[PDB]
């Protein structure tokens, strides 16, 4: 959903992301690794 | 108003009274959710 109270460039950036990195996000989806940010954080911050 | 009920008298009529309407203010309290999507604000309320 189109943002509220949050930046327009910042929203731009999520979405773009969550698409260029589809199939990582979902063949990891319950893969976690150390210094590496996991793919169950990306899709809540995409979600969002 | 005067005007044009001169030229707007039957035979045998007449309008012997004239009354005037006073204004009540109706403060009508309303509660509205919106869509999670919704793209124009200032449109939502002109319609509402």
Redesign the interface.
Same mark, same amino acid.
């Given at each position: 959903a189109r943002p509220l109270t949050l930046d327009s460039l910042d929203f731009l950036s999520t979405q773009r992301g969550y698409l260029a990195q589809q199939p990582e996000l979902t063949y990891q989806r319950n893969n976690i690794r150390i210094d590496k940010v996991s793919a169950l954080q990306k899709r809540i911050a995409a979600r969002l | 108003l005067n005007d044009f009920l001169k030229d707007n008298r039957n035979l045998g009529e007449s309008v012997s009274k004239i009354i005037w309407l006073q204004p009540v203010d109706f403060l009508l309290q309303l509660d509205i959710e919106l869509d +999670? +999507?919704?793209?124009d604000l200032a449109d939502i309320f002109a319609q509402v």
């Open positions: - | +999670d +999507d919704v793209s």
